[PDB]
Copies of this chain bind each other. A is one copy, B any other.
Amino acid sequence: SLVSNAFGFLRLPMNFQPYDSDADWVITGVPFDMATSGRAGGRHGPAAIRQVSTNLAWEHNRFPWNFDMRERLNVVDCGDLVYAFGDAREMSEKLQAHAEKLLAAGKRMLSFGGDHFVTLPLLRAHAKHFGKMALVHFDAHTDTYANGCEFDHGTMFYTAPKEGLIDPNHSVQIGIRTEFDKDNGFTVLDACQVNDRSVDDVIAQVKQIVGDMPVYLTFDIDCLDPAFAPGTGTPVIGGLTSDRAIKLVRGLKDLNIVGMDVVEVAPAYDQSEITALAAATLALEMLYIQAAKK
């Protein structure tokens, strides 16, 4: 083989027909953006994450694991959703259709954004297959705005509870450091207390909030402090280090995580690919916690 099908995330094989493949996990890129009050995310966050992820591919057993995820899980990259270039409605319809087809086939999904709005169609499809979920949500923002429209940025986790896709009472939002509503049922572990508490202390509280519910894990890269993730459309100071974030993600290993995504990487604002690298490393860690179960 002089040229090869090893062109996707972590040099994994591409499969443009994933639904009836032998894959366990399928990576989908959704380079969807919408006009915001601040900067736009752009159309290259899936591409920047894939490109920088070659920094991680040489490790046979990614630190600190004692196995190779690739020998426990069959992971393929199906490329990008064609309708990510449509408006919020068109993108949502096609993404939910893509997701339902994969979940019905027994595949699970790691998806890369794109604006955080991509998580709402994913949650609609996941709720159909797995039932109402607990949300584990890393972000500087709660995204529970209740006064905007159905397709507005920052409203996904008002709509999701209203549609019964997630149980807010068993959901946790980690790293929040912008105005939020204390009485909507979500448990907000704000960045101030998360930076001051030990990882094990936070993880113990997350496990007790989530319980045994199926979990959708959604990681907005702007959860990280802008020193570690300058490449994002809506930065907020006082965030998490990449050390603390990856340790928190590893601590989620014993949860029943049924799907996950990483969103808001904005390459136009990245500095020496550090934001894309943090996103790729967190995404690989999400695959490792799944493979640790097998």
| Chain A residues near B (Cβ < 8 Å) | 1-7, 14, 16, 18, 28, 33-35, 37-40, 42-44, 47, 51, 54-55, 58-64, 78-83, 85, 87, 94-95, 97-98, 101, 176-180, 190-192, 195, 225-228, 230-231, 234-239, 241-243, 246-247, 268-274, 277-278, 281
Complex contact A5–B16 (CB within 8 A)? yes
Q: Give the distance to chain B from A228, nearest Cβ to Cβ, in Å.
A: 5
Question: Which residues of B have CB within 8 Å of A14?
Answer: 7, 14
Bound complex: CA of A16 vs CA of B246, how far in Å?
35
Q: Give the distance to chain B from A79, nearest Cβ to Cβ, in Å.
A: 5
Other than the given A34-B35, A237-B246, 5 more pairs (CB < 8 A) read A7-B7, A37-B43, A43-B54, A55-B235, A237-B277
From known contacts A277-B237, A281-B237, infer whether A192 and B55 are also in contact, taking CB-CB under 8 Å: no
Q: Give the distance to chain B from A155, nearest Cβ to Cβ, in Å.
A: 14
Contact of A271 among B3, B55, B230 (CB under 8 A): B230
Bound complex: CA of A16 vs CA of B1, how far in Å?
9
Q: Give the distance to chain B from A4, nearest Cβ to Cβ, in Å.
A: 5
Q: Give the distance to chain B from A60, nearest Cβ to Cβ, in Å.
A: 6
Provide the main secondary structure of the chain A interface: loop
**Which residue on B lies nearest to A270, using beta carbons?**
B272
Question: Which residues of B have CB within 8 Å of A180?
Answer: 63
Complex contact A7–B63 (CB within 8 A)? no
Can you list 20 A-B contacts (CB < 8 A)?
A2-B82, A2-B83, A2-B95, A3-B18, A3-B79, A5-B79, A33-B40, A39-B268, A59-B178, A63-B176, A63-B180, A191-B243, A225-B242, A225-B243, A226-B274, A227-B242, A228-B237, A237-B242, A238-B246, A271-B272
